[PDB]
Amino acid sequence: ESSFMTLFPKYRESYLKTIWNDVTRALDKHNIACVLDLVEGSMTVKTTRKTYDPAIILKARDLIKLLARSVPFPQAVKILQDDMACDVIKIGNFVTNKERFVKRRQRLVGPNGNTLKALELLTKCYILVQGNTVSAMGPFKGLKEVRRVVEDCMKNIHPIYHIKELMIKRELAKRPELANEDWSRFLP
Amino acid sequence: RIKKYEQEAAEGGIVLSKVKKGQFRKIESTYKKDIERRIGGSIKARDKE
């Protein structure tokens, strides 16, 4: 008999109260019980005596983590989906210069959100740049490329380079001629 | 809605695209409803004044 708990601050308290019938519907559909506490700001999920997927309870743990980290409900359920995962990526501990750090992550998110929407769409992922952390949910490959790209952008390679690299790799994979080559003569 | 969104992200800090001082922040809601054909970029009377 297993369970997990995680904590939310007050604004997410508001939206969580708003959505709670939905998360209980979904965890009902998978036969997992969940409880919301407004006094301790707490959120618990627990296994039943009729459930048969402790993998799904692990999923639900990561679910509630995402909800408290404030991605909305449709993305919550898309993480409860089978072949998906979310990932916390630390980017606080790279640049000593405060303004340089702030500037570099601003470059990551890109003007008018252009860079963010572009990389998200290419990777089928969903990305939330949270202060000194980055959260990424999606299919496993998508997370892999996202982690590499965000790390280089915290480093000193422009995501503009990375988006072009992803696009070229995308076309190369799309055309099924070269299934065993280096491709380095293609990539920039 | 834009005030709600800025307050949302700012208050749970999610770094955003730096909008100018004048215009309206651009979001998926305005991309999808195609509102600026009817409202505009920003209030040009205030911009000229």
């Binding site: 572009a118 769409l121 988006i163 | 999808k32």
Partner: peptide
Amino acid sequence: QNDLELQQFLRESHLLSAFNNIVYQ
């Protein structure tokens, strides 16, 4: 910066995303 298809994909990224309901060629 002086590339032409990439910049175009960026500036159209939002449109494609909110009108898919991937294609950018």
